[PDB]
Ligand binder design. Sequence first.
Ligand code: CL
Ligand code: CL
Ligand code: MG
Ligand code: MG
Ligand code: MG
Ligand code: MG
Ligand code: MG
Ligand code: MG
Ligand code: MG
Ligand code: NA
Ligand code: NA
Ligand code: NA
Ligand code: NA
Ligand code: NA
Ligand code: NA
Lengths: 160, 95, 140, 154, 186
Amino acid sequence: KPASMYRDIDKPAYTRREYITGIPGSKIAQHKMGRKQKDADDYPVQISLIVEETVQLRHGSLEASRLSANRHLIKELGEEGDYKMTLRKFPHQVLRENKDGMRAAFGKIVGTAARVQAGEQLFTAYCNVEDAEHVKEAFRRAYNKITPSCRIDSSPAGNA
Amino acid sequence: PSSNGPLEGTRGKLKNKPRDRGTSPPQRAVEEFDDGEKVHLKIDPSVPNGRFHPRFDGQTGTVEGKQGDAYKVDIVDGGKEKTIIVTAAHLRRQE
Amino acid sequence: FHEMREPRIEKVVVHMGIGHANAEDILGEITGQMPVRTKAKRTVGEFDIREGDPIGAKVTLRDEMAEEFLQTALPLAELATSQFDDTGNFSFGLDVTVNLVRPGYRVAKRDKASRSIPTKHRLNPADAVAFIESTYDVEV
Amino acid sequence: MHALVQLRGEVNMHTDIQDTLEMLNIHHVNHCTLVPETDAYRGMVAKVNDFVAFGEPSQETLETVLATRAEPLEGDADVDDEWVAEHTDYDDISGLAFALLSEETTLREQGLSPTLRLHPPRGGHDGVKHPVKEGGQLGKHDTEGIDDLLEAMR
Amino acid sequence: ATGPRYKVPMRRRREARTDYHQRLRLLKSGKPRLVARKSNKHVRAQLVTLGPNGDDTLASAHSSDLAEYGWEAPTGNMPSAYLTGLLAGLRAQEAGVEEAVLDIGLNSPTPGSKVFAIQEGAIDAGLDIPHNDDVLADWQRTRGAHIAEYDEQLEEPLYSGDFDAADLPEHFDELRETLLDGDIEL
RNA sequence: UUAGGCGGCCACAGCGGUGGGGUUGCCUCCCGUACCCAUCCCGAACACGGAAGAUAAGCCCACCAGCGUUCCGGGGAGUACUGGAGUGCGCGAGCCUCUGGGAAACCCGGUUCGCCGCCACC
RNA sequence: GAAGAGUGCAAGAGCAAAAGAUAGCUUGACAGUGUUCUUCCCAACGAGGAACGCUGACGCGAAAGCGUGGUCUAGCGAACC
Ligand SMILES: [Cl-]
Ligand SMILES: [Cl-]
Ligand SMILES: [Mg+2]
Ligand SMILES: [Mg+2]
Ligand SMILES: [Mg+2]
Ligand SMILES: [Mg+2]
Ligand SMILES: [Mg+2]
Ligand SMILES: [Mg+2]
Ligand SMILES: [Mg+2]
Ligand code: NA
Ligand code: NA
Ligand code: NA
Ligand code: NA
Ligand code: NA
Ligand code: NA
């Protein structure tokens, strides 16, 4: 189904798992990528992907964009390259669907989504000055698979 | 409201803040008031008896005599006058 | 200072944890005074569903009764290092327990203005071994 | 002491906002009034803020408006120096005007109507959809600003 | 103590000095309390009323200032107790106080105790106090008879600091009569 | 209050810690069961009787801020949110200007190791 | 070790020298008649319900005092016969 059905924040927070049963599992394989044993401060450059509009991103989109970005970093740096990316959001809002007409219309559980306010960083990668152009490209592919417009922002890096 | 009992929607107003938990000081439970006196109505979560209907919480009546140890306090609900039976444990002097 | 700091025996609790009693007869003849029944709480698979019911007996000895008894009990056991409480007590064995502490103890056992004994003025594992070993036997 | 002038109509105005205007003695568009600067009075004009124009007028301007638009509690009658002299605790319009600004007396106390019914602003005003800061005519004005408006509604 | 959400008891509860549940029930009468308190060596009796900033004591007596009228014996006993109650009871009648309710604090209502002796004294002093006759010790033990019979089993003199040998319940009688006089300084 | 009793507010009073103080005075520990009374077993406790001893406990006094709590400064922040108004912007979800209010987390620095009433007493 | 236990049953709330546990005693889960609030916010409306009194008779306690059922909010029914 289309994201047009769930992209806006137009419903109350629905995250209490103590009253919601049958919630589908998340498609997000991993949140901590690269070299998780190493530290974030052990890198010269740090670039985050900033969301420009306040929206809702379904776990399907998080997996697709996280996948297509890290897949690039693995292709250009290797399965054990020097870097570490971070998907700093987890899908908490549960989604319904009215799948009778408008009689007894409360929907059944169909998925999960992460709410991101405009200005927040969805992803944050850490790499050396050399790999700085690869992380940018990996993010270019990432903002192509999520609803909002995005700003690729280099936080600690004056080696431009 | 899904129901219509007296304790409906009273979770907040009839619950003690953690640090005020436990039995309350006898001083205010034995207080004495005079007729014509202005008093504030507020239930003490810790005291079970001498209570009034929760809707009246927050009022400011006028003492007009007593019925036993309890007091008879006059108030105006909206535009209708009412007489409330209440103990000092749930009362405070105005001003 | 030392006099109001020297160790003493508060009580000696002689108890027999059975499980259903007919053992009271001997526990009284070994100490000198009357015994007390022992009930329980919570259901048990070992056919112990009845909450309040006889299981064991005990006798709390104070003063002379305590020392006189110990003048036979202690010789029957072998004291060890680990066999001591953090507060300076010890149990061995039929079981026999001995509670020790210093002079100003009534402060925590009375009713009015009662107070818990400060960590400093409390007996220690070492202070216990000393006092007791200093009474008809050996330590570790 | 500030001068209040109603610039926006009543239709679609909040009931409680309109009742404040009535308490301050103004019942029609273009009607003016003089108010002492007190905690209580200050609350009332803040609520009316988006439908009025206010500020402290100069001694002169007030004199002109009083000369031209002031009226007795009843009847037409021109309020001039002679009139002021024969009915007020003053000698001329100026004495009255000074006492007002200093909040020593009121128009009622002197037997004058609390309201100055003005004429529309010659050359038109700056619009009633924006405040003074945004180029409009609503809200708090300057002494120069308030004089400009009042002199135009001469 | 542990954190923000933690509950710390009222001060007089931490101090193990005030039974608030009994205190309230006591205050419900509307009458002034007769505070009966003892010590290892002494006894005390106060007449307390309620006040805006804390209790107001209107009258009192101590077993120490008992001697001030004739005492020359111990003060942590039965005779001492009764007499201290009567004394306090009389000073009370003088302040315009007419009735009271016995407040025994954290003591036990054991039949024939000193708090009851204190209570009997105040009743004898002319105060209207709710009581029960068959809970007060028998007249002789109040006088100090039980103690005379104890020293009757002499062998080794009971009282160290000489007041006598066999002790004197008669001294008690002398003291009672001395207080019942109307002139006496109160 | 050179050590006491009854309290109000009920952690600014909690947690933890250092130092000081008592011969016929005070409070304790303390000593002891003939009595009143007591332990489903124990004068442990409760209760009664009493001073040979002690200031080591408690208690009272002075004091330390590590944790917890109260308030305050500066910073966060006039930020987040918001009551009134707009032919202001945006495809739209939404934003912005004017007017009146105004936060929490957190960091840094002070504060707080109780205040007050009645009675008795060297 | 201030409360996470327990307190009959939903959920939310109350309770620690107790409203919990144990033990012992007791039948106030008593009769009669009201004031008030609720039912029905404001604002009229029955049954039912609750708080708080009075008269009468009792239980327990040294006594203040507590007991008008169960810590509080569900467990209810007109006329005619
Ligand atoms: Cl009510
Ligand atoms: Cl006492
Ligand atoms: Mg709410
Ligand atoms: Mg006219
Ligand atoms: Mg024109
Ligand atoms: Mg125009
Ligand atoms: Mg010391
Ligand atoms: Mg009840
Ligand atoms: Mg029919
Ligand atoms: Na259907
Ligand atoms: Na996009
Ligand atoms: Na409380
Ligand atoms: Na039994
Ligand atoms: Na101490
Ligand atoms: Na009814």
